């Protein structure tokens, strides 16, 4: 030990604010709290990691395993130092040696990596990194492409059975077996998180509360250690363990000694949590989870779940669902919105207090247009949530759908309510023209549900005609909600099937582009993970929208509606 500090272990309640003050003024409290924890601990000898026959086995000499808790390999007689591998056993909130902090194997080390997985009887590998970063290699690829099917590393034969590529991580299902040994194949689970930058942090803390949700779910048929590794086996990896461990700690004592725990970590493995940001990440991780909890229902249980989520027993009280919706932290004046509020540009907003955040408004190649970028399930795919153009922007509207190369447009409104215009009419029967571009409606197909108009677009630079589809859902007043939902869904079938997957292809609008457009965007995203995972986190999906535009799902009616349709369209 040395002289660090004595930080008071945060209790649930005060966590939210403790956090708030701890971060104030570029979070210098945190900075020091973190700057006090030593890189390494000089007492714990490190004499094996430094031997010569073992120096090619490391990736960076900056990070070396302590001698006392270093993971050892079966000594292969003859081969000098054939017991060393860069990896350290890590203790959890309780379970001692719950994890194994491993440095990403080197090509010169792949074999020794799979040997450690066989010997320690691990059945869960948590890879938090990418093999390549900055045209610099961070981790050798130690597994068979789904295509080569099987590959043996030394005596360890690894056969892949599944490769499920999700938005942030890819989950593989491997089967290993030692072949110079009658023992039988074991079921290995390998998650790879790809939305986590070396030396840095992910886009949102929920992404971490996410893979933690996933790993704590996998089978560990052998009570073996959990292999967590990145490039050096200290940064992102140690950070992960931070969240995981400290989250058990919360669910148990309702307090968390992050500072303490990280020290315990820098005591088991050199410079674990390596960044003030990663340090703060663990906290936000905790704050966020404690704050909103776990809101991700699986398709298996969606129906039963919701039902009770709706029952609000003492009727004198709200429902569990309502509870949730009320937890949804609307991001009021969340970020800068100056642009949309400039003099001349104030007359370009159908709805005054529905201005895109300066942080994502759509640049009008700048120039001002009241539409903003909305995140898509598959990142980085993106949608454009705009408002019904104004007869005084009917032009700019088209210039946007061109520059941004919009393929399909979705109109959720009518053209007006008797007198009151709910939208302009950016399209005519003729060959309408606006600025450097001219539209030309080619087909107008109406159905009892929605009506589809095919446009052909061009600018004086002819022989480029870009066909643009517009779908117009009628059945949906800013009063009621989708009258016949089942068809609002089909509306989405055709829409998604007219978009070419993985280049902004889509654009969705309505009066203000938040009112109904919110429910739409929310559905597209929930429908996607609903297909690619069978898991649905309506809360977070909505929490993201609110974070992008003032307006999305603002009423419980709408909120509860997401649950209804997601549920009813999956018995």
């Amino acid at each position: 030990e040395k002289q660090l500090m004595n930080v008071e272990p945060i209790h649930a309640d005060i966590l939210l604010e403790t956090y708030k003050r701890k971060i104030a003024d570029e979070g210098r409290p945190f900075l020091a709290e973190f700057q006090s924890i030593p890189r390494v601990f000089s007492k714990f000898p490190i004499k094996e990691a430094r031997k010569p026959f073992n120096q090619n086995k490391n990736r960076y000499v900056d990070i070396l395993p302590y001698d006392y808790n270093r993971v050892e390999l079966s000594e292969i007689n003859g081969d000098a130092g054939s017991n060393y591998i860069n990896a350290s056993y890590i203790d959890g909130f309780k379970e001692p040696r719950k994890y194994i902090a491993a440095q990403g194997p080197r090509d010169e080390t792949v074999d020794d990596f799979w040997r450690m997985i066989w010997e320690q009887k691990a059945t869960v590998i948590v890879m938090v990194t990418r093999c390549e970063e900055g045209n610099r290699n961070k981790c050798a690829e130690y597994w068979p492409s789904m295509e080569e099917g099987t590959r043996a590393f030394g005596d360890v034969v690894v056969k892949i059975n599944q490769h499920k590529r999700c938005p942030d991580y890819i989950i593989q299902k491997l089967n290993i077996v030692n072949k110079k040994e009658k023992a039988t194949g074991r079921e290995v689970t390998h998650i790879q998180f790809t939305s986590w930058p070396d030396h840095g942090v992910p886009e949102d803390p929920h992404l971490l509360l996410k893979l933690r949700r996933r790993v704590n779910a996998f089978s560990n048929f052998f009570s073996g250690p959990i292999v967590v590794h990145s490039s050096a086996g200290v940064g992102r990896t140690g950070t992960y363990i931070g969240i995981d461990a400290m989250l058990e700690g919360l669910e148990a004592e309702n307090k968390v000694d992050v500072y303490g725990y990280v020290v315990k970590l820098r005591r088991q493995r050199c410079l674990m949590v390596q960044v003030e940001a990663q340090y703060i990440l663990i906290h936000q991780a905790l704050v966020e989870y404690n704050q909103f909890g776990e809101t991700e229902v699986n398709l298996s249980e969606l129906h039963p779940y919701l039902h009770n989520m709706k029952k609000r027993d003492p009727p004198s009280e709200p429902s569990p669902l309502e509870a949730e919706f009320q937890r949804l932290p609307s991001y009021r004046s969340w970020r800068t919105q100056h642009i949309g509020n400039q003099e001349e540009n104030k007359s370009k907003n159908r709805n005054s207090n529905v201005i895109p955040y300066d942080y994502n408004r759509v640049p009008l190649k700048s120039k001002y247009i009241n539409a903003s970028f909305i995140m898509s399930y598959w990142k980085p795919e993106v949608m454009i949530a705009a408002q019904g153009p104004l007869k005084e922007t009917i032009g700019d509207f088209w210039q946007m759908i061109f520059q941004r190369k919009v393929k399909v447009i979705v109109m959720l409104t009518e053209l007006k309510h008797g007198d009151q215009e709910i939208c302009a009419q950016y399209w005519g029967e003729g060959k309408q023209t606006y600025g450097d571009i001219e539209v030309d409606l080619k087909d107008t197909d109406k159905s009892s549900t929605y009506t589809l108009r095919v446009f052909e677009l061009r600018h004086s630079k002819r022989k480029d005609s870009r066909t643009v589809y517009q779908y117009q859902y009628t059945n949906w007043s800013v009063e009621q909600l989708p009258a016949e939902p089942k068809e609002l869904i089909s509306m989405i079938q055709v829409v998604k099937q007219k978009l070419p997957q993985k280049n902004t292809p889509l654009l969705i609008h309505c009066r203000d582009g938040s009112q109904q457009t919110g429910i739409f965007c929310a559905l597209l995203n929930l429908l996607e993970s609903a297909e690619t995972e069978e898991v649905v986190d309506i809360f977070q999906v909505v929490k993201a929208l609110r974070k992008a535009r003032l307006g999305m799902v603002s009423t419980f009616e709408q909120y509860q509606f997401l649950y209804d349709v997601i549920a009813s369209t999956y018995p």
Binding site: R59, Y60, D62, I63, H199, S231, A232, V234, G235, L271
Partner: peptide
């Protein structure tokens, strides 16, 4: 090499 070096991790920093």
């Amino acid at each position: 090499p070096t991790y920093s």
